[PDB]
Design a protein around this ligand. Structure first.
Ligand SMILES: NC(=O)c1ccc[n+]([C@@H]2O[C@H](COP(=O)([O-])OP(=O)(O)OC[C@H]3O[C@@H](n4cnc5c(N)ncnc54)[C@H](OP(=O)(O)O)[C@@H]3O)[C@@H](O)[C@H]2O)c1
Ligand SMILES: Nc1nc(=O)c2nc(CNc3ccc(C(=O)N[C@@H](CCC(=O)O)C(=O)O)cc3)cnc2[nH]1
Length: 159
C-alpha cells in the first residue's frame, strides 16, 4: 500500500531552484501527522533538502549512486525502495518530482496540499487522471498570521 504526499502550488509546482516563497506551517504539521511512524521513500535530492532522517521512521533514499549516510537506507530502484520498507500498512513517498512520477502508478492514495501560490519552479507533481482518483477528504484553509497563502488538504484514493 503506497501513498504519495506532496505540497503543490499552481501548475502542480512542487520544487524550484531555491526555497519555496511561502511559509506554511499547517502544511508541515499535516505532512508530519500523515507520515508519522510510516516508512518514507524519497529521492536523493529530497533527502538532501531535509538535512537529516524524519524521526521515528524507516527513511528510504533512492540514488543511482551508493549511499552516503548510514542513518538511512539507500536503494537503487523503485522496487528496492518498496522492498526496503518491509511489510507495513502504508508507505509514504515524500518526493521529489522524479520519485513521485515513478510511484504514482503504484500508489493507492495521494495526500496533496493545494497551495494558492503563484511560483515558477522546475519540478511538478505528476498528472493524476481524476477518473483514477477519488477525492475522499478536502479541507480548505485561508491564509492567516502563520500561513502565507491559502491551502487545501486533500486525500484521494485510487479507484
Ligand atoms: N533538467 C532539469 O531541469 C533536471 C533534471 C533532473 C533533476 N533536476 C533538478 O533536481 C532538483 C530536484 O529534482 P526532484 O525533486 O525530481 O528530485 P528527487 O526525486 O527528490 O531526487 C531525484 C534523485 O533521486 C534519485 N532517484 C530517483 N529515482 C530513482 C530510481 N528509480 N533509481 C535510482 N535513483 C533514483 C536520483 O539520485 P542520484 O542523482 O543520486 O542518482 C535522482 O537524481 C530540481 O531543482 C530539478 O530541477 C533538474
Ligand atoms: N504536504 C506536504 N508538505 C511538505 O512540506 C512536503 N515536503 C516534502 C519533501 N521535502 C521536505 C522538506 C523538509 C521536511 C522536514 O524536515 N519536515 C520535518 C519537520 C521539521 C521542519 O522542517 O521544521 C518533519 O518531520 O516532517 C520534510 C519534507 C514532501 N512532501 C510534502 N508534502
Amino acid at each position: 500500500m503506497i501513498s504519495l504526499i506532496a505540497a503543490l502550488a499552481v501548475d502542480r509546482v512542487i520544487g524550484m531552484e531555491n526555497a519555496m516563497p511561502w511559509n506554511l506551517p499547517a502544511d508541515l504539521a499535516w505532512f508530519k501527522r500523515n507520515t508519522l511512524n510510516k516508512p518514507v521513500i524519497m529521492g536523493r535530492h529530497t533527502w538532501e533538502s531535509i538535512g537529516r532522517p524524519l524521526p521515528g521512521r524507516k527513511n528510504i533514499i533512492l540514488s543511482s549512486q551508493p549511499g552516503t549516510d548510514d542513518r538511512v537506507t539507500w536503494v537503487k530502484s523503485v522496487d528496492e525502495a518498496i522492498a526496503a520498507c518491509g511489510d507495513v500498512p502504508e508507505i509514504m513517498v515524500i518526493g521529489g518530482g522524479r520519485v513521485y512520477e515513478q510511484f504514482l502508478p503504484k500508489a493507492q492514495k495521494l495526500y496533496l496540499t493545494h497551495i494558492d501560490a503563484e511560483v515558477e519552479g522546475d519540478t511538478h507533481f505528476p498528472d493524476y487522471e481524476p477518473d483514477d482518483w477519488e477525492s475522499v477528504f478536502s479541507e480548505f484553509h485561508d491564509a492567516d498570521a502563520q500561513n502565507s497563502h491559502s491551502y487545501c488538504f486533500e486525500i484521494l484514493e485510487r479507484r
